[PDB]
Every structure is written in structure tokens, then in C-alpha cells.
Amino acid sequence: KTFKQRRTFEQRVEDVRLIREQHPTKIPVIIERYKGEKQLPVLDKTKFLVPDHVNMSELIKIIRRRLQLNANQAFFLLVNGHSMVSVSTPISEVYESEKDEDGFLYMVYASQETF
């Protein structure tokens, strides 16, 4: 079901290395719905190339537009299993401190602050 489950560590690593080669200015992001989530829909894909100059505040807007949410639906985004300390941080910086050992940046969203 989950990305890490579908692909071998060998396969996730080799894909991050191809994204470096072919989208060198992009951050490789895995974005997944909380497995408990009742309200928000599932995304159409799992793997996103994010421009490395966008801050986390702008990534949340992007995903809220991809889900086609409206202004009073709630949305919470975990990065590497934990809350974001700040939405002002550029994704290139977040990536360097929160990336996984396979080289993807893992994110999970829910309508409740409790995942």
C-alpha cells in the first residue's frame, strides 16, 4: 500500500539518483494521506518534483490546490514523521535536514493535528 512498501530501498535510491540527473533543480517529495484520514481525499500520485526555492507555506498551498480544498477545510502536513517547526523555511534547506536515507523527503497529510 505505502510507497516504502511498494519499492525496495535499492529502487527508491536509484529513482532519487535519476531525478538528480533529469530534474537537478527539483526536490523529490513523497506525499501520502494519513492511513486514518476520513475527510480529505487521496492525491492522484505519490511522487512530486518540488522547485527547491519554494518555502513550506507555498508547498501547503500547492497541495491544497491539488486536493481542490476550500477555505474552511483543515489540512496538516507532517515532514519526516513530525510537525513543521516553520512554514517560512525553503524546501532546499528542509530537504538537507529532513530527507530519508533513500533520498526522498516523506510527507503525510490529515484534517486533524492528531495523526
Residue numbers of the site for ligand KBU (CB under 6 A)?
Answer: 48, 50, 59, 62-63, 66
Task: Tell me whether residue 13 or residue 43 sits nearer to ligand KBU (CB atom).
Answer: 43
Q: How far is CA 104 from CA 42, 47, 49, 65, 68, in A?
A: 20, 9, 10, 22, 25
In the complex with ligand KBU, which residue's Cβ is closer, 48 or 95? 48
Distance CA 80, CA 93 (A): 14
Report the distance separating Cα 82 and Cα 1, nearest Å.
21
CB of 39 to ligand KBU, least distance (A): 17
To which H or E segment does residue 93 belong? helix 91-98
The binder of 23, among Cl ion, ligand KBU, none, by C-beta within 5 to 8 A per type, is: Cl ion
- Residue 30's binding partner among Cl ion, ligand KBU, none (Cβ under 5 to 8 angstroms by kind) is none
| Distance of closest approach, residue 10 Cβ to ligand KBU, in angstroms | 26
Cβ atoms 34, 1 nearer than 8 A: no
Give the interface with Cl ion as residue ranges (CB under 5 A): 23, 25
